[PDB]
Amino acid sequence: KVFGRCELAAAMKRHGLDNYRGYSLGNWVCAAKFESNFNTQATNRNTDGSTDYGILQINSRWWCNDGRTPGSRNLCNIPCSALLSSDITASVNCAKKIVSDGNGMNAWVAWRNRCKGTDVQAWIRGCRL
Ligand SMILES: [Cl-]
Ligand code: NA
Ligand code: NA
C-alpha cells in the first residue's frame, strides 16, 4: 500500500513520531518518502543475504528475520514479513528502537542524504484542513 503524503504523516503523528527523540514529524515523512516512496511493501534485496523492508526500509541483517540472512540479528524480535503489512505500526516501533541507540536517523541512508540539509517541515505542510 502506497500512502498519501498527508495520510502517512497523520498516521506517523498518531504513532507518536512528532519530535520523538528530537526528530520532528517531517523528518519521518521525508525518510519514508525517500526510502520506500511511501510504499509499505517496498523491498530491496541487498546484494548479500540482507534485505531492506517496508516503508522505512528496515534491514534484515540487524532488526528482523526473513530466514535468509545467515548470522543476522533480530533486534526487534519480529519477522520481516510483518513490516510489509500496510500498517506502519511494526515499521514505526522498530524504528523507535533504532533512533534511540545513538546515530540516530543517520541509520537511514536516504534520510542522511536527502533530508539532513533540506527544510523538512515542508514534507508535512498543508496537511490539516
Ligand atoms: Cl517537521
Ligand atoms: Na535471518
Ligand atoms: Na517492536
Author numbering: 1 to 129
Task: Give the original sentences from the paper that presented this experimental model.
The needle shaped crystal with three molecules in the asymmetric unit had a diameter of 25 μm. The resolution of this structure was 2.65 Å, crystal belongs to orthorhombic space group P212121 with unit cell dimensions: a = 31.4, b = 92.3 and c = 114.2 Å. This crystal was refined to an R-factor and R-free factor of 20.60% and 30.45%, respectively. High R-free and R-merge values may be due to anisotropic diffraction or radiation damage due to X-rays. Total 47 interactions including four H-bonds and 43 non-bonded contacts were present between ten residues of Chain A and five residues of Chain B at the interface. Chain A residues: Asn77, Asn93 and Ala82 were involved in H-bonding with Arg112, Lys116 and Arg114 of chain B, respectively. Chain B was also weakly associated with Chain C through interaction between seven residues of Chain B and nine residues of Chain C. Analysis provided that there are three H-bonds between Arg73 and Gly102 residues of Chain B and Gly49, Arg68 and Arg73 of Chain C, respectively, besides 28 non-bonded interactions between these two chains. However, PDBSUM and PROT-PROT based analysis computed only a fractional gain in the β-sheet content (1.8%) and decrease in helical content (0.7%), in the trimeric state due to the formation of two parallel β-strands made by residues Cys64-Asn65 and Ile78-Pro79 in addition to three anti-parallel β-strands (between residues 43–45, 51–53 and 58–59) known to date27. Interestingly, residues forming additional β-strands in our structure (Cys64-Asn65 and Ile78-Pro79) may lead to destabilization of β-domain due to their close proximity to the residues known to initiate unfolding process. Further, we also observed that in the trimeric arrangement, chain C interacts with most of the residues which form the active site pocket of chain B. This interaction implies that if such an intermediate occurs in solution, it should reduce the bactericidal activity of this protein.
